[PDB]
Design a protein around this ligand. Structure first.
Ligand code: TPM
Ligand code: TPM
Lengths: 218, 215, 218, 217
């Protein structure tokens, strides 16, 4: 199978700047009819993909002239002359020359902004949940940038990796930050066998760990 | 205008089969190929195969040979994809697309394969416990746990509180979904005024309100 | 340096009373995080301090509800709605918003009891000490209340301040009174140069000074 | 449960240095700061500074720069404070404390700096000048002067006389300790019956008995 390799995986950009994305194939995607079947699609969250460019450099109907495609053989490039807000999303290259047709892994464009430390909040299990034999400890790590962050749960000083469920939001349209939710689910009994609960975050914005904790009795 | 309209979301049990429809309008359907694509985890895109409407001839990605069956109904300008012997790995979003003057995409069809039964969510208000800073802003939360199937709609104060809200994508745990939502408000607002998280789950005809009460 | 001032210095209370202690800073104690890092600690004799309240009004884990804290800017107050036996000790406020962090001088909570007149006893040097060339004249002022007392030493009618060492007991656990020992140290020769030695005390229980005295040649 | 356990009391000579340890348990040590505090004469509290375990970074009270050195051993969850070039003014109780969800304090470490050598006490009987007023209740005493180091134990009549006894905290005079003890008994018991103060000073294995006899002297 022809492998399509896109670089970079994610690209922080500034509105109005010029950006270029790369797509390389493991072998030539030249077709016997003299044409090269390389396409570029754009997919925004929650929507279906939309074709931008086909046959390497042909612009699909309605696509702005700021989008341009070039390349030949195994190296292809998509260029956006002046990036706009509506251009943000995931870009995928596709080859339709050799069966099975394949897609690249995608390149995600996000807005670049200043770093921001997460605002961390920790919540002990609600009274109502405990009465059912369950205990979920929740930690919110809100409005931070960049997206790279490591969250660890420490119970009585010991790291707990089992029972942890994480979820992240997409880049916020208003402040360009990211948010994350981390939930530690235990049994009512397990929860009562310990006292110290810590949600620890490691982020570029702080030398030492960013933490929030609580004790089971207060 | 050219449009490819797909059938709505499907919830099916493992081992069964399902048919996804792709209705075409605005052009000569019988003359252009219809392709099918699978998108797993809202990321990876995989080409399944295509069908030539006139001849019924098909070309597949070996990986999907046997799993998918492609057909077309010339009279109604509709293409169909049958997925057979469904497994959990078949859960994904499926798209049809054509090769007309470039490529037009259908809106997608979400397929969820599971043995789980409709289950209402348990809604738990999350108020700050033992010390959460006596200063400026306060973050409150709402945990929606153990429901099926998607989706649930979460609002704060019936939609009045929109700014400072973060609702996180649901995660699958023990065959059921769980999601959380946080809201940050000036501490001059809470607990002086009431803050409520409203949860609606259409599938189970559930509508729950949970006030966030101190301690 | 932000100076912390606590008033009063000592507060006599009866079990069950409702009291309020004051702590003031020479300058505002607002920190960058938008917070006020003010703490109240309690220290019992022979023990390490214990946190009661932090961030002006937050109760520390395991601290009974009878303790309440409030204040703003430069004036803070610790309130105890119902004094219990466990609440007797020294209370310290602390500011952690401006380096170097500082503590107040402390407010001592003591048990209030009925007035008690001191039993005063004076002792001339022992023959054994004189043989070694030393001469310590001792005055005991036992079982009195309140604690406020002023003791003066007079040699031949003249007040003597140098060479005087005082030591106090803490409030008695049985009768709630205080006791004190005052020692006047001299050399054998100096002790031999004078004749009249007096230990004089002024206390709330007597309208005139309480005096105990002895003459060397008797 | 969260605990901060400090090392034991130390008696050191001026000019030397000492290391006070503070072992943490019950939470992730690397996540919170360790502060050090000094308490002189069981009254005034002074903040020395703190250390950030992860980075080793420190913030000090200018008054303690050079005097104290703060370090940490991540593997053993222990913080250390080194007091250097000791002088008499360094004698005090030192506490470590953290900033975990409020403040947890260590039990404290008492440091005594002195160049004094072990010296047994001189015990002097304190009898009222011939007789103090005469009858009802009479007060007798025992002066324990010039010993080092603390402590001394003072009992009356081998512990038989327990009520009416006041033993005062030792005071430092000329680099040595001095303390006094008083006992009050019915005038109908003394001088008829004997009253003796028993003094023991463990450090010097000294044990002395001094019976209180009338006449001041
Ligand atoms: N040779 C060729 C291959 C594929 C196509 C259609 N391109 C597609 N884009 C992405 C998936 C849907 C089909 C046209 C010509
Ligand atoms: N900004 C801030 C300053 C100090 C502290 C810890 N408070 C302490 N209480 C008294 C001495 C030990 C440390 C926490 C936060």
């Amino acid at each position: 199978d022809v492998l399509m390799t896109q670089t970079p995986l994610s690209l922080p950009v500034s509105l109005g700047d010029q950006v270029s994305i790369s797509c390389r194939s493991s072998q030539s995607i030249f077709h016997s009819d003299g044409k090269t079947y390389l396409e570029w699609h754009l997919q925004k969250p929650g929507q279906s993909p939309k074709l931008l460019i086909y046959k390497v450099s042909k612009r699909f109907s309605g696509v702005p002239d700021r989008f341009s495609g070039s390349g030949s053989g195994t190296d292809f490039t998509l260029k956006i002359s002046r990036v706009e807000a509506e251009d943000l999303g995931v870009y995928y290259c596709f080859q339709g020359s050799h069966v099975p047709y394949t897609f690249g892994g995608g390149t995600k464009l996000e807005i670049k902004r200043a770093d921001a430390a997460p605002t961390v909040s920790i919540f002990p299990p609600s009274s109502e949940q405990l009465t059912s034999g369950g205990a979920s400890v929740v930690c919110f790590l809100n409005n931070f940038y960049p997206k790279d962050i490591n969250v660890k749960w420490k119970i009585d000083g010991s790291e707990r990796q089992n029972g942890v469920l994480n979820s992240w939001t997409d880049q916020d349209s208003k402040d360009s930050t990211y948010s994350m939710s981390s939930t530690l689910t235990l049994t009512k009994d397990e929860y009562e066998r310990h006292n110290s609960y810590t949600c620890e975050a490691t982020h570029k914005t702080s030398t030492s760990p960013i933490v929030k904790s609580f004790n089971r009795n207060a | 205008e050219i449009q490819l309209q797909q059938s709505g979301p499907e919830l099916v049990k493992p081992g069964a089969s399902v048919k996804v429809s792709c209705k075409a309008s605005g052009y000569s359907f019988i003359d252009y190929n219809i392709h099918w694509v699978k998108q797993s985890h809202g990321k990876s895109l995989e080409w399944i195969g295509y069908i030539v409407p006139y001849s019924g001839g098909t070309t597949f990605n070996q990986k999907f040979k046997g799993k998918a069956t492609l057909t077309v109904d010339k009279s109604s300008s509709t293409a169909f994809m049958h997925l057979n012997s469904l497994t959990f790995e078949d859960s994904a979003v499926y798209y049809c697309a054509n090769d007309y003057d470039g490529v037009y995409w259908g809106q997608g069809t979400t397929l969820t394969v599971s043995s789980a039964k409709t289950t209402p969510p348990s809604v738990y208000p999350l108020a700050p416990g033992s010390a959460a800073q006596t200063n400026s802003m306060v973050t409150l939360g709402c945990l929606v746990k153990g429901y099926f199937p998607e989706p649930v709609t979460v609002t704060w104060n019936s939609g009045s509180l929109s700014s400072g809200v973060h609702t996180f994508p649901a995660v699958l745990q023990s065959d059921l979904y769980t999601l959380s939502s946080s809201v940050t408000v000036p501490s001059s607002t809470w607990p002086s005024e009431t803050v409520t998280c409203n949860v609606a789950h259409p599938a189970s005809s559930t509508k729950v309100d949970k006030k966030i009460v101190p301690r």
